[PDB]
Design a protein around this ligand. Structure first.
Ligand SMILES: Nc1ncnc2c1ncn2[C@@H]1O[C@H](COP(=O)(O)OP(=O)(O)OP(O)(O)=S)[C@@H](O)[C@H]1O
Ligand SMILES: Nc1ncnc2c1ncn2[C@@H]1O[C@H](COP(=O)(O)OP(=O)(O)OP(O)(O)=S)[C@@H](O)[C@H]1O
Ligand SMILES: Nc1ncnc2c1ncn2[C@@H]1O[C@H](COP(=O)(O)OP(=O)(O)OP(O)(O)=S)[C@@H](O)[C@H]1O
Ligand SMILES: Nc1ncnc2c1ncn2[C@@H]1O[C@H](COP(=O)(O)OP(=O)(O)OP(O)(O)=S)[C@@H](O)[C@H]1O
Ligand SMILES: [Mg+2]
Ligand SMILES: [Mg+2]
Lengths: 737, 737
């Protein structure tokens, strides 16, 4: 529903074109039935719209040879104009055009490379028939009679509308030929097709940029106003500049790029004039887009600033931006990488009220980035872009660009022996043999290049319910207070409660308190944030009180979200617990968590799950009825529960049928899940030890498990079982005394 | 009494006009009896006063057709001039007017759109009779003979008083027609009708602005002086700029707007001249109002300032403002969002002595804001603005503006399939089908848009006495020391005491110590401030000693107020209690609270209520006779008291008559109110679990309660009951040893 605009379906008229047996690759595709709805008369040309204001004209009504009701595929229409299939193309007439009078010929590498002669009748006579060069400023045509070597372009634009070359004219031989850099630079512009892994973010940009300007009367009738402030923020390298460069070409509005350091490097008083002129320009025309790059580099905080000239820029910006009215139709956009170093006065009502966050993509996001980035390189058949995306975790779109370059350099390293450093030019018989293989990427994933920045990742865990053995009742209970209050909200206002948000896990260590938290988030298809114990202690190093609030602020925006706190024992261990040094374990970070938890609304979908293994040093203040009410105890697995753990831990291992899984169930009594995992990890090393010494077979036998039982140590003493059971029944009574 | 001016009643002469059956909608309303009190002779026009210096003239003495003693409702008087009914309109004669001589015709979209011809006798002949265009600069009339399409306005103003067009003149055809932006911009000005949820605040502004200037002789006879400094402060987004923009149009005095960043962005020495000229202008005329926006952005603290030019502005302002005398009649107004970042020298006697605080509105306040904001949008019949106001808690007038825009965007999202992005213009047969439905707001209340700033809210709690079960004596006792010393102050000076302010609650947890504090505040119709335990610990992060004093300062101004401290155990838990690490639990925040409490006057209405559940680690210093004297102990509910708790917790649930409420009273012995609430919350989930699985009935049966008794755990041990009773009798003896 939210992304229904981007969908392109529900049209039986159109279909996918298969491979045809026709060899007619020198004619356009024209069909008769489509000719009955247009009102085109017997004119000269047909006007159509493509993309990026780039079209192409050819001979009309000349095919009548190929199949019908099918667009003929050509080897020249796949590079320009059209790039794919599934785009709606509309045509409209445009009379009162102005024909051209005099257009000269400007060659590049066709006349100077060969023979010049008269440049009129040398090779143009066999083409000047039935068409007086129907050319246009922005079209690249093709004509030759020799060795297939010709490339002609035009740069002079005398008329504003479309023009047609008239016969009986002269040739202006006093012009400068165009070089290669100019045509190459304005041919490889980026667009919406070069952005991968970001679909929801780009949907919101269109609804605020390509709708108020194109259809200004839509919002006037309703009575609402479009936003005039859009702010982009995220980690450095996500691709913020790509969005700015892509929205500047797909839209037919004026774009004015504003640099951050360029304004900051001007003289005294010169910086203030360029800002005024930028807006005085944009207010002249109705369609205008203003983009500012690195806003924080030009308008920092006014309290940590020692220079008056630096504050003058902030004052000038605050003066110029709030002076905009409705009829100006000016949209101001900005992008930065430090949302916290901003000045508070900018992100207020009227200046920057709408914000777009660019998060770190998951494997699906980076797969598309790799596919679109490696579209022109020569790849082999053993490559696999899906496998690479699984091993990369902290890689943003900037890292994938360098990874491919490193892989290409490693691939071409091995061809060092037949070329030389002092050699003049490389021979062409080895130029075509370079191809990136699978082993190239494996070496690139083991150096300092993958060493990048990695932060708190908000995504959906891949842990399923099949990886957890036993605990039938816990899984049922977890689904009755997370899945129900989200999928069917109508079941709660009828009886008249509010759902209870908050569950605390307690029990002996090594029972699987993290897999339960991940599986419930995976089942409901919600976000998951994992904050560990020591991370909160080390985060607070320079006494900053703004490093925990934005965690809740980020979790609130990504609704539904599951906020989980892991290893809650280390925090209580900082002071000691109930008595500690003499006070309590209610330290600086406990109060912030309690205050942020108490302020959450009852209509939100942010669910909080707690887990700990020290039910004797917990803070009584957190057990209040309204922060963490639910108490779930996970006991040690019994004989029946341990059957599934071994089968779940051996899914990817070729276990032989002779191994009796039920025999090891009764052998182990005081062993938890971690002990069984250790037993599996130890017993399967014997097969590797034997297989590596046999080389001077690849399957785990029965004798491998019998050897590890004499070395399997117990991790849970008999005294701890007697102590956990006491707190398993009387835990809510700890408050007060 | 305080708001008696705003009341409009006590007048039997006027009444409400109902619907009439007359179809005469082309004539003015004139009545005979009202013609006997005025002294208007047989002149030409009648002068009357409306609002915003905008009037309207028409044909006088021509109706004599409609009913009598009733103002006829018209379809053209509801847009301009008059907007409602109940305003006193007075008339006065004004002789010695100057008639006009030459007024040309300036069309907008009536002459250029069609046929021009001579522009004199084309369509104006059938109107030039019995009236020589009685027009005025500020009136919009209506005349047509075609398709009802005409809009004529005038911009040239040669005479100062009212003028009448004289016959036998010429037409000045050398003028520039007026565009659409100019007429639209000065038509939608904001006023007092666009401010909702603020009635008491606007009452004080009038008594200081629209009274000393209009009636300067009132204060001279008494011998007092009107204030010359008004400061506005509050959270960002409350609508401070609206008040400034509204008071500038409803008053007939000169207004000069002063920006904050615009002055700060000037050159060296240029900023000081604009400030001098602003006052040198205002001193010329008697009625003058000076408003400064964002005072803190121009005059910060002089100790945290590194620039000399920035301090020069503060020195210049301090020099210019105190130089004003009585006869200048100049009122200086300012508005800021950070009252603490101010310079101390400005908020003194003579510069800024009077301050207006704009608090966060309650549900009633935001309902009016929503009603006035959604006055032009197309709403459906299933909408309900009252329900939306209940779910929004931390929403200021700025947030409601964006909420409606988001709802409108969501409503128009679903119409994506019949319009296209590349389409030229939208057809008119779907332009009228857009309407906001109920489901639009539900989606808007679940995204990042409602995520706004929320602070300490001062309002009246909605908790009544019917939601509390038992405790007959506690409710009676609470009414004898809060309700009595406020409603009937005369009962205390006769016998000769001072009332005792301060009550401390102590007892086992989960008995309802917060509902008692809220109900007494609700009954007496007073404010309520809830400050929790951890909030005081986390507030003090950067060692600021000005974060607790303004809490008492704010509570003092909103008299009567009830200041309540919740969870007073965590503060004592910071050090340990009586012994702790070796010292005491009298930490940094205890002394501030004690010092602020000792300094309160005995004539104030600020009542302080304390509540805790740790009567063994309390500070003996706080039990002094004069801070917290009253000691109230809340015991566990008995069999009789628990009868009402279940009935109070099941008011919104359809409980069947077969469920015996008296059967569960004797079954529970050591269960407090929280345990019963948990039992209710657990037993009613079984009905939902059954109703969700039956779909592959909506009423709680008897078997749902019998299942939860086997899982109901006790939260109060037998040892804690024996310990609370000891302190319930000997608590005041803890002081000294
Ligand atoms: N989604 C993407 N698809 C393909 N290439 C991408 C993508 N995102 C980033 N890149 C590439 O990575 C580069 C990173 O540049 P940007 O992230 O745009 O720089 P930035 O956002 O301004 O942040 P800086 O430069 O580190 S301060 C881009 O220029 C592209 O070459
Ligand atoms: N039922 C189970 N089936 C398979 N593996 C399990 C099961 N329960 C636990 N494990 C594994 O045992 C290990 C326990 O890791 P954790 O989740 O960290 O344990 P924990 O309960 O969170 O307590 P700690 O303090 O972290 S050891 C992981 O490797 C799990 O994959
Ligand atoms: N009572 C109200 N009724 C209707 N609309 C309101 C009301 N209060 C605020 N608004 C709207 O919300 C906007 C908020 O602007 P203001 O609060 O006036 O800005 P400000 O008070 O100067 O504080 P800033 O701009 O955040 S520093 C107004 O411009 C209105 O559009
Ligand atoms: N007499 C009662 N009738 C109905 N509900 C009650 C009654 N007494 C308490 N409750 C409920 O029980 C819960 C107790 O919450 P609190 O007011 O926080 O308890 P408290 O006495 O303040 O002590 P703590 O430390 O906060 S648990 C709330 O959900 C109340 O609505
Ligand atoms: Mg773990
Ligand atoms: Mg309470």
């Amino acid at each position: 529903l939210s992304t229904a605009i981007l969908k392109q379906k529900n049209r039986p008229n159109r279909l996918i074109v298969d491979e045809a047996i026709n060899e007619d690759n020198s004619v356009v595709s024209l069909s008769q039935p489509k000719m009955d709805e247009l009102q085109l008369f017997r004119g000269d040309t047909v006007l159509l719209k493509g993309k990026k204001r780039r079209e192409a004209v050819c001979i009309v009504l000349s095919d009548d040879t190929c199949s019908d009701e099918k667009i003929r595929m050509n080897r020249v229409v796949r590079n320009n104009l059209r790039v794919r299939l599934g785009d709606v193309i509309s045509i409209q007439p445009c009379p009162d055009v102005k024909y051209g009078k005099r257009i000269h010929v400007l060659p590049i590498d066709d006349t100077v490379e060969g023979i010049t002669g008269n440049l009129f009748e040398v090779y143009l006579k066999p083409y000047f028939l039935e068409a007086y060069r129907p050319i246009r400023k922005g079209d690249i045509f093709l004509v030759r009679g020799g060795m297939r070597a010709v490339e002609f372009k035009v740069v002079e634009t005398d008329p504003s509308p479309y023009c047609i070359v008239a016969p009986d004219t002269v040739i202006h031989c006093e012009g400068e030929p165009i070089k290669r850099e100019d045509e190459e630079e304005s041919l490889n512009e980026v667009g919406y097709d070069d952005i991968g892994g970001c679909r929801k973010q780009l949907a919101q940009i269109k609804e605020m940029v390509e709708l108020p300007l194109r259809h200004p009367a839509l919002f006037k009738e309703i009575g609402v106003k479009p936003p005039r402030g859009i702010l982009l923020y995220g980690p450095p390298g996500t691709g913020k500049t790509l969005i700015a460069r892509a929205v500047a070409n797909e839209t037919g509005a004026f774009f004015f790029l504003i640099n951050g350091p360029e304004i900051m490097s001007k003289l005294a008083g010169e910086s203030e004039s360029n800002l005024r002129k930028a807006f005085e320009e944009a207010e002249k025309n109705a369609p205008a887009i203003i983009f500012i790059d690195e806003l924080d580099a030009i308008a920092p905080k006014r309290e940590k600033t020692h220079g008056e000239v630096e504050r003058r820029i902030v004052s000038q910006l605050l003066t110029l931006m709030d002076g905009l009215k409705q009829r100006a139709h000016v949209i101001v956009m900005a992008a930065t990488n430090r949302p916290n170093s901003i000045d508070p006065a900018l992100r207020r009502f009227g200046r920057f009220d709408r914000e777009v966050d660019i998060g770190i993509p998951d494997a699906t996001g980076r797969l598309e980035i790799l596919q679109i980035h490696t579209k022109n390189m020569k790849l082999a058949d053993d490559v696999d872009l899906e496998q690479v995306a699984n091993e990369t975790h902290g890689h943003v779109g900037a890292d994938l660009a360098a990874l491919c370059s490193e892989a290409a350099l490693q691939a071409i390293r091995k061809k060092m022996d037949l070329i030389d450093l002092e050699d003049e030019t490389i021979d062409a018989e080895v130029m075509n043999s370079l191809a990136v293989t699978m082993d190239d990427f494996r070496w690139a994933l083991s150096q300092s290049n993958p060493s990048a920045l990695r932060e708190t990742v908000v995504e959906v865990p891949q842990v399923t319910w099949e990886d957890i053995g036993g605990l039938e009742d816990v899984k049922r209970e977890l689904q009755e207070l997370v899945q129900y209050p989200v999928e069917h909200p109508d079941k709660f206002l009828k009886f008249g409660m509010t759902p209870s948000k908050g569950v605390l896990f307690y029990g002996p260590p090594g029972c699987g308190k993290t897999l339960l938290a991940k599986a419930i988030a995976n089942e409901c298809q919600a976000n998951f944030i994992s904050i560990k114990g020591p991370e909160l202690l080390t985060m607070w190093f320079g006494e900053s009180e703004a490093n925990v609030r934005e965690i809740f602020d980020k979790a609130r925006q990504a609704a539904p979200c599951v906020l989980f706190f892991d290893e809650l024992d280390s925090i209580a261990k900082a002071r000691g617990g109930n008595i500690g040094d003499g006070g309590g374990a209610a330290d600086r970070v406990i109060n912030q968590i309690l205050t942020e938890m108490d302020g959450m609304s009852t209509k939100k979908n942010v669910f909080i799950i707690g887990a700990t293994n020290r039910p004797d040093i917990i803070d009584p203040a957190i057990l209040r009825p309204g922060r963490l009410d639910q108490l779930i105890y996970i006991p040690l697995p019994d004989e029946k529960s341990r059957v599934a753990i071994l089968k779940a831990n051996l899914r990817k291992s070729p276990v032989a049928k002779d191994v009796d899984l039920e025999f090891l169930a009764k052998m182990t009594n005081g062993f938890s899940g971690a002990d069984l995992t250790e037993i599996c990890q130890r017993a399967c090393k014997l097969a590797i030890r034997e297989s590596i010494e046999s080389e001077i077979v690849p399957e785990i036998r029965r004798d491998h498990f019998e050897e590890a039982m004499r070395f399997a140590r117990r991790s849970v003493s008999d005294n701890d079982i007697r102590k956990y059971e006491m707190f398993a029944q009387t835990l809510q009574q700890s408050r007060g005394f």
